[PDB]
Amino acid sequence: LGSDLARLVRIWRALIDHRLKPLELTQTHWVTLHNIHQLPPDQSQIQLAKAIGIEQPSLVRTLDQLEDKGLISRQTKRIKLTEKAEPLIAEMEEVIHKTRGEILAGISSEEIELLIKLIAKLEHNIMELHSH
């Protein structure tokens, strides 16, 4: 079940990746942009790397690639979304929001409160088995 969930997460992200092709970003690139946007300000490289699911050196390379594309700025060092990146992220977020909606068609509002509940339960059981 854990690997059925793992797999579902992978194919959801892959669907979004596929919808975002016109942006000419790798998956690591956009997932990194999205995380910068989503986390509060002034994340450390180490936190962004963890949030993103990649190793530290890959994250460093990603940010250096994102800088070359004018999508992030490191002028302090703090990691900001540039002004050229703001329109892309809005487009990206829009794709993300619309896709979620489509994926959730044919799922009652009932199974949906339920999934949010069972996820939370699972996440709670996992938190508890940590202490143990």
Next chain:
Amino acid sequence: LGSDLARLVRIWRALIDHRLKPLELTQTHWVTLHNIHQLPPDQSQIQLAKAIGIEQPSLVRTLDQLEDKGLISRQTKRIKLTEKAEPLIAEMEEVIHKTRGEILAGISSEEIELLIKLIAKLEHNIMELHSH
């Protein structure tokens, strides 16, 4: 919801990582061993890398680290679990199986058929929005 699922998957894997510490493997290492065991024989580097969620060069490095530890053999090149690795994987699998059980405590057998069903539904909606 997609990121609530993403996060749940991350913390489940982290719980397993935490239970496997005595094996003195990084998370990339054990996730790689587990995938080799789980996939059918003779996977290409590229397939294993994708299954695992890492870049190609990281996978290559991982396999070269796993070889140094006597855990994989590349004598053809085909990627095998060595005989020293067989006992570890059984222990690992046992941790995985026991942990799933614990995580699923307090979840009716009812919400559980239901989750397997809603996951499949989701995965089906995603497959379909691909064609589109």
